[PDB]
Ligand binder design. Structure first.
Ligand SMILES: CN1CCN(c2ccc(OCc3ccccc3)c(C(=O)Nc3cccnc3)c2)CC1
Length: 261
């Protein structure tokens, strides 16, 4: 029935593990986002995490259907598109829009981490907008459990997107999940405020990453950023994950608490 219930109108994007399509129902014309996977059982894990999600700043999971070898995952379509499309290259966006999206990103991330889930691929492509421009964290294909029965487990898989990835994930055999998601959030904030990513990756072979470690914020992208948010970015984009600021402390930051417009 699926082909008789739903029409796949277009490609929306690809997750790390899969591809998702705009689907419109042939009776109701209801429009949804559908992820279709040809069935290895990473998907079983993805589904199970998707079933846990209940928050305003996380995408809405409708449910799943398995037909043939193929699995179907249905989710709320984000009528606002992705955050990536609100970033003007070389410019970013107005500082108050950035702050609001960053407040919302932090709300979603706090939520995930409080259920012991790490997203592992936070970037503007995976941050979607509803009709009222409320941000929603999407794509749980790399998400995983880092805390269960109140015990933390360290991660050891490299994954994500290079320019968003924390430097410890390139160097350490094992590392803590939360500080890696905090890192990526800082790269997203950079992108929102400067319309460009600071480095290809956070390794010593990368000159722009060295420049930042030497504190040369007279260079781009940093020179485009006002002093208050830059001060936050200095706390987030700290190489040593154990000195990196934590989300509770982000919520006390000066710019984070600045009334804007
Ligand atoms: C008017 N249109 C409305 C829809 N517009 C739009 C554009 C990209 C999208 O996803 C990109 C994506 C991001 C991550 C992974 C794959 C694809 C979605 C969307 O709703 N996707 C989605 C929803 C729920 C769960 N997952 C993805 C919607 C573009 C503007």
């Amino acid at each position: 029935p699926f082909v008789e219930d739903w029409d796949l109108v277009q490609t929306l994007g690809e997750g790390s593990f899969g591809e998702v399509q705009l689907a419109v129902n042939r009776v109701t014309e209801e429009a949804v986002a559908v992820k279709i996977v040809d069935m290895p059982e990473n998907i079983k894990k993805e589904i199970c995490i998707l079933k846990m999600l209940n928050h305003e700043n996380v995408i809405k999971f409708y449910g799943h259907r398995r037909e043939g070898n193929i699995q179907y995952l249905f989710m709320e379509l984000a009528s606002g598109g992705s955050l990536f499309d609100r970033i003007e290259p070389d410019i970013g966006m107005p500082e108050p829009d950035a702050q609001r999206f960053f407040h919302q990103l932090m709300a979603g991330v706090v939520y995930l981490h409080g259920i012991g889930i790490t997203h592992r691929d936070i970037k503007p492509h995976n941050l979607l907008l509803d009709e009222r421009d409320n941000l929603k964290i999407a794509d749980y294909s790399l998400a995983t459990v880092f805390r269960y029965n109140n015990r933390e487990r360290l991660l050891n898989k490299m994954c994500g997107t290079l320019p968003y990835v924390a430097p410890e994930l390139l160097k350490r055999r094992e590392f803590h999940a939360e500080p890696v998601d905090v890192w990526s959030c800082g790269i997203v904030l950079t992108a929102m405020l400067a319309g460009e990513l600071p480095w290809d990756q956070p390794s010593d072979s990368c000159q722009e990453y060295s420049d930042w470690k030497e504190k040369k914020t007279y260079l781009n992208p940093w020179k485009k950023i006002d002093s208050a948010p830059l001060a936050l970015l200095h706390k987030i984009l700290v190489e040593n994950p154990s000195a990196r600021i934590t989300i509770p402390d982000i919520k006390k930051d000066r710019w984070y608490n600045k009334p804007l417009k």
